[PDB]
Structures are given as structure tokens and as C-alpha cells.
Amino acid sequence: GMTEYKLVVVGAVGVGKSALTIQLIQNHFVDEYDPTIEDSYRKQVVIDGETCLLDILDTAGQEEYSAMRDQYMRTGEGFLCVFAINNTKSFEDIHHYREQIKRVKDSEDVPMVLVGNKSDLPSRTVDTKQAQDLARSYGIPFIETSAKTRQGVDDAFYTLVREIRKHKEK
Numbered sequence: 001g002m003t004e005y006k007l008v009v010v011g012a013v014g015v016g017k018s019a020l021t022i023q024l025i026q027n028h029f030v031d032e033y034d035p036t037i038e039d040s041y042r043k044q045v046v047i048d049g050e051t052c053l054l055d056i057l058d059t060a061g062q063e064e065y066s067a068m069r070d071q072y073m074r075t076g077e078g079f080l081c082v083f084a085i086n087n088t089k090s091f092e093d094i095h096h097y098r099e100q101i102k103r104v105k106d107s108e109d110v111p112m113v114l115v116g117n118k119s120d121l122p123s124r125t126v127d128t129k130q131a132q133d134l135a136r137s138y139g140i141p142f143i144e145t146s147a148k149t150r151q152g153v154d155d156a157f158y159t160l161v162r163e164i165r166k167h168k169e170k
């Protein structure tokens with residue numbers, strides 16, 4: 001089978017995890033998607049000449065059992081850590097996501113990309129510099145996106161795949 005990349009989108013409720021995933025998979029912006037729904041989506045794509053499958057888990061937070069959370073973190077190869085540029089709390093939550101994923105996988109080298117969503121809004125509480133400062137400390141890429149206009153979306157997911165490749169080659 002073609003190579004499959006298991007990607008996990010995490011982040012506080014309302015940041016745009018679902019909008020981002022649906023924009024990537026289906027090429028349209030969904031204004032309203034039930035915040036409590038969590039599912040996986042698939043799309044066959046070509047990244048740097050490689051035909052591959054993206055298998056993406058659109059997370060929604062607490063699970064029936066915490067074991068389910070741990071299971072998808074061990075299963076996931078790469079993680080989009082999403083905050084919204086007008087939601088400071090969501091940006092502060094990144095610390096917890098970074099920590100928890102590393103903790104569950106028991107690894108210091110987990111492919112991640114920092115994603116600042118809703119870049120189409122002039123309303124902003126989190127400056128680019130402040131997110132760059134965090135990304136720098138993590139040694140991971142940072143990309144500002146808009147699920148609304150699609151700006152940065154392919155870049156976000158494709159960069160995460162490229163981070164997975166760099167991890168695999170070690």
C-alpha cells in the first residue's frame with residue numbers, strides 16, 4: 001500500500017480543528033460543526049512527488065475513557081497543535097498539549113507543527129512574534145492559517161508530513 005501518515009489535530013475547543021480538517025479534505029469552509037464530534041478523515045494526496053494517504057484524527061477533547069486519548073497519541077505519528085490568534089487561552093493551552101503528547105508517547109522527538117488559526121481576522125490577542133518565540137523553543141515549524149480562506153492549510157498538513165519523514169529517517 002502507499003505510505004499512510006497518521007495525523008492528529010489537537011487544540012482547545014473553538015480554535016478551528018474541524019474547519020481546518022474539512023478545508024483540507026473537502027476544500028470548503030464549514031461555519032458550524034458540532035464542537036463535540038470527533039472523527040477521522042482520509043485523503044489521497046501528492047506531497048513532494050510522493051503519492052500517499054493522509055489519515056487525520058479531528059479531536060474534540062475529553063474521551064469516554066482517558067485510555068482512548070492515550071491510544072490516539074501513541075497511534076498518531078504527527079500532531080498539529082492548533083490555537084486561535086484571537087484566543088490567548090488556546091495559545092496557553094499549547095504547553096499542555098506539547099507536554100501530554102510527549103508524555104504519552106514517552107518521546108523527546110515527536111513530529112509537531114504549531115498552528116495559529118483564524119489569521120483572516122484582524123482581531124488578535126496573540127502576536128506572530130509570541131508564537132514564533134514558542135515554536136523556536138520547541139524547535140518545530142509555526143504556520144499561521146485561515147480555514148476560511150484556505151491560506152496556510154496545505155502548508156500546515158504537508159509540513160507535518162515532512163516533519164514525520166525527517167523523524168523516520170533517523
Ligand SMILES: Nc1nc2c(ncn2[C@@H]2O[C@H](COP(=O)(O)OP(=O)(O)O)[C@@H](O)[C@H]2O)c(=O)[nH]1
Binds near residue numbers: 014017031120149
Ligand atoms: N474567521 C474564521 N473563523 C474560523 C476559522 N476556523 C474556524 N472558524 C470558526 O470558528 C468556530 C469554531 O471552529 P471549529 O472548526 O468548530 O473549531 P474546533 O472546535 O477546534 O474544531 C466556527 O464558527 C468556525 O466557523 C478561520 O480560519 N477563520
Ligand SMILES: O=C(Nc1ccc2[nH]c(Cc3c[nH]c4ccccc34)nc2c1)[C@@H]1CCCN1
Binds near residue numbers: 006007072
Ligand atoms: O469515532 C469517534 N471517536 C474516535 C476516538 C479515537 C480514534 N482513534 C482512531 C484511529 C485513527 C484513525 N486515523 C487516525 C490518525 C491518528 C491517530 C489515530 C487514528 N479513530 C478514532 C475515533 C466518535 C465516536 C462516535 C463517532 N465519533
Ligand SMILES: [Mg+2]
Binds near residue numbers: 058
Ligand atoms: Mg471540532
